[PDB]
């Protein structure tokens, strides 16, 4: 199997910016009529890849000339010479040349901007949920830049890791930060023999963690 | 112009096959070249599954094949996908593609989950704390996916974050937030509404204080 190799996996840029994405093939993708089946997708949000070059350097019907593709033997570059808001997404290589027909892992094209600490919100479980025997404990670390956070759990002054679930929300469309949900789910019982729990937004620390809490 | 559509169960059970139909238009699945089904993994990496092209001879990706066959009806303008011993790690969006001299057109994908779980209703936990105010919403325990979280039936939009199911275990769960002006709450109604289609749920949820 070809394997494909994408240079960067997050790229990070602000509007009008040039931004370049490379795609390293493991092996030669010269196909036995003399073509390259090098081919260019974007993911964006919510919808489907959609092709934007193929045969290394041609654009596909509707895609601006600000994308250009280019490469040879096994170094590819798409070039996107001034970023425009539409253009965010995930970038991904394709290969059609030997089967089986491979892609690599895609870029993240992202929107840069200032560092914003997280919005911290802990909140108790709901009395609904008691009275099935279940307790979610919910926080929300809310509307910060860049990725470099994580959640620590405490309940009782010890760090808890089993019964967490986190989510993770896309670049936001409104400022372009980031969000996140954690979800400590314990039986009604755990709840009711314990009284401090507290949420954390840590950042390679060193640092001071923002700090959720309340007593049961 | 030219369409590419997939249609098919969105819910099959390991073991069991997942078939899946792309009806093309806008020309013929008779004109070249290749006539593909690719799959993206939840949240993750596309696979090429294999292909059947314009002469109706089919190539697959060595690990599918097997499993896969690839098949066509030219009178009706559609080709097929046949995908055998499922398992859970079959759950994905696939899509059907064509490719030729024009370069390719895509389907819009067609999620297919494969679980051995039956259709369980969300239970929506209303979330109240303990300037500006956050409140939130538990879409706990639920299958299969989708279901649809608004606030105040979507008047409310500006500061919310609905965030993505994880799953845990054979049911998904999911939150949502808001945050509104202190002035606003308790003063005003901020409520959750959760749909659930796939059991007919349809659940509004006030946030009260506690």
Redesign the interface.
Same mark, same amino acid.
């Given at each position: 199997d070809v394997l494909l190799t994408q240079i960067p996996l997050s790229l990070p840029v602000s509007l009008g910016d040039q931004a370049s994405i490379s795609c390293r093939s493991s092996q030669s993708i010269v196909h036995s009529n003399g073509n390259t089946y090098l081919?260019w997708y974007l993911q964006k949000p919510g919808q489907?890849?959609?092709?934007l070059i193929?045969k290394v350097s041609?654009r596909?019907?509707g895609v601006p000339d600000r994308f250009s593709g280019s490469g040879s033997g096994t170094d590819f570059t798409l070039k996107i010479s001034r970023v425009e808001a539409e253009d965010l997404g995930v970038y991904?290589c394709?290969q059609?040349s030997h089967?089986?027909?491979?892609?690599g892992?895609?870029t993240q094209l992202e929107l840069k901007r200032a560092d914003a600490a997280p919005?911290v919100?802990?909140?108790?479980?709901?009395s609904?949920?008691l009275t099935?025997g279940?307790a979610?404990v919910?926080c929300?670390l809310?509307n910060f830049y860049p990725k470099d956070i994580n959640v620590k759990w405490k309940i009782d002054g010890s760090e808890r890791q089993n019964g967490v679930?986190?989510?993770?929300?896309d670049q936001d469309s409104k400022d372009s930060t980031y969000?996140?949900?954690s979800?400590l789910t314990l039986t009604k019982d755990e709840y009711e023999r314990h009284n401090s729990y507290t949420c954390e937004a840590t950042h390679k620390t060193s640092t001071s963690p923002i700090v959720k809490s309340?007593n049961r | 112009d030219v369409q590419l559509q997939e249609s098919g169960p969105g819910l099959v059970k390991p073991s069991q096959s997942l078939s899946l139909t792309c009806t093309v238009t806008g020309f013929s699945i008779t004109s070249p070249y290749?006539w593909?089904w690719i799959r993206?993994f939840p949240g993750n990496?596309?696979?090429?599954m294999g292909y059947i092209s314009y002469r109706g001879s089919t190539?697959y990706? !060595?690990?599918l094949k097997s499993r896969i066959s690839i098949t066509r009806d030219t009178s009706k303008n559609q080709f097929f996908l046949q995908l055998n011993s499922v398992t859970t790690e079959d759950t994905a969006?696939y899509?059907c593609s064509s490719?030729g001299n024009?370069?390719?057109y895509?389907?819009?994908?067609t999620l297919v989950t494969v679980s051995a779980a039956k259709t369980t209703p969300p239970?929506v936990? !209303?979330?109240? !704390?303990?300037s500006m105010v956050?409140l939130?919403c538990?879409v706990?325990g639920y299958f299969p996916e989708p279901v649809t979280v608004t606030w105040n039936s979507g008047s409310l939009s500006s500061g919310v974050?609905?965030? !993505?199911?994880?799953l845990?275990s054979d049911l998904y769960?999911?939150?949502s937030?808001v945050?509104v002006p202190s002035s606003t709450w308790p003063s005003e109604t901020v409520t959750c509404n959760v749909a659930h289609p796939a059991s007919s749920t349809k659940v509004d949820k006030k946030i009260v204080p506690?």
């Open positions: 081919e489907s890849p959609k092709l193929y041609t596909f019907s991904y394709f059609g089967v089986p027909l491979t892609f892992a895609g919005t919100s802990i909140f108790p479980p709901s609904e949920q099935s279940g979610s919910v929300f809310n679930l986190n989510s993770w929300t969000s996140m949900s979800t309340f | 290749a593909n993206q990496t596309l696979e090429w190539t990706h !060595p690990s969006t899509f490719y024009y370069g390719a895509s389907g819009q994908g239970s936990y !209303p979330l109240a !704390p303990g956050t939130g538990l706990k974050h609905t965030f !993505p199911a994880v845990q769960t999911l939150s937030s945050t506690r």
